[PDB]
Amino acid sequence: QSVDQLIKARGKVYFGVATDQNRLTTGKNAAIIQADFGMVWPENSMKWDATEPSQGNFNFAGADYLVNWAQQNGKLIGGGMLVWHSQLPSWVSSITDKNTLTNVMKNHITTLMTRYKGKIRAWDVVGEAFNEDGSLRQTVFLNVIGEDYIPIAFQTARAADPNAKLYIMDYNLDSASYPKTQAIVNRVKQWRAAGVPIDGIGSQTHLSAGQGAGVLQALPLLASAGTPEVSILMLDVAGASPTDYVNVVNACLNVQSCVGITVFGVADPDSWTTPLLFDGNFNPKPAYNAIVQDLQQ
Ligand SMILES: O=[N+]([O-])c1ccc2nn[nH]c2c1
């Protein structure tokens, strides 16, 4: 059975998966994605290192491949990460001038979003902008542009493609008692009150064993920021316990603004702790069956 079809029948938009050309050309990834997932996200092909490895010299081959594959197979598409401190070319981090970096960041956002205009359901505009204590991570963007880099990124993205849902995403938003979760909520509330177009908070849900339970409280907390949408993304779970996976699914089911869930790959050997839903033989694991059973009605 298809977790995407079943979650849609529960009123959600999609059950998605991260992938890219190297997965879709090998093994059973394409067949599993065709059958079981309604949205694809690029594991790497839309990050800054892949798409703009030297300034103004864009490489769209991998991103084009994924977008084309998705359209041919009837899948929704997400993109990202537009602004991130990891996988960032040295030519970017070497910039110390505010105007220069602002213009570079805007051009990077606008170029990618314009190329795929109208084809992308949601973009991860800014990723991993928070320290664990809830302060803002001191990246080149923060240090050179200042705190306005987040407003600027979102305003630029909205102008480039107003069809897309614009997300901020972060990890360790899995417990309501951890400072980072309330901190991003507070800053997103404030940004939106200032007119910044943040449509979504995406929770990069990389769990250890037993951490699914806390998501039942953390995801409603994220939704209290008042964004149009929240989502689970890059989901994986060390040990792949059905209990942890079912808890995350139920958290999304319980939150009206949660639009869907994306799992961080297909088969365990291709994971970034056997933490995915398909084994090395590309067979569904107990956690996959448990999600199916939970979503059936
Ligand atoms: O939901 N995802 O797994 C996922 C993977 C790669 C991404 N890049 N930007 N957003 C992403 C989400």
Author numbering: 4 to 275, 279 to 303
Sentences from the paper on this structure:
Here, we investigate the molecular origins of the nearly billionfold rate enhancement achieved by directed evolution of the computationally designed Kemp eliminase HG3 (7). All HG3 variants have an inactive conformational sub-state, rooted in the original protein scaffold, which was gradually supplanted with a catalytically competent sub-state as evolution progressed.
Increased ordering of the Met172 and Met237 side chains, which interact with one face of the TSA and likely stabilize the charge delocalized transition state through London dispersion forces, illustrates this trend. Although relatively flexible in HG3, Met172 becomes better ordered in HG3.7 due to shortening of residue 84 through the M84C mutation, which enabled a stabilizing interaction between the terminal methyl group of Met172 and the π-face of Trp87. The resulting conformation helps to position the catalytic base (Asp127), which samples many unreactive conformations in HG3, in a single orientation with the geometry required for proton abstraction. In principle, Lys50 in HG3 could act as an effective oxyanion stabilizer and constrain the ligand in a reactive pose, but its side chain points away and forms a hydrogen bond with Gln90 instead.
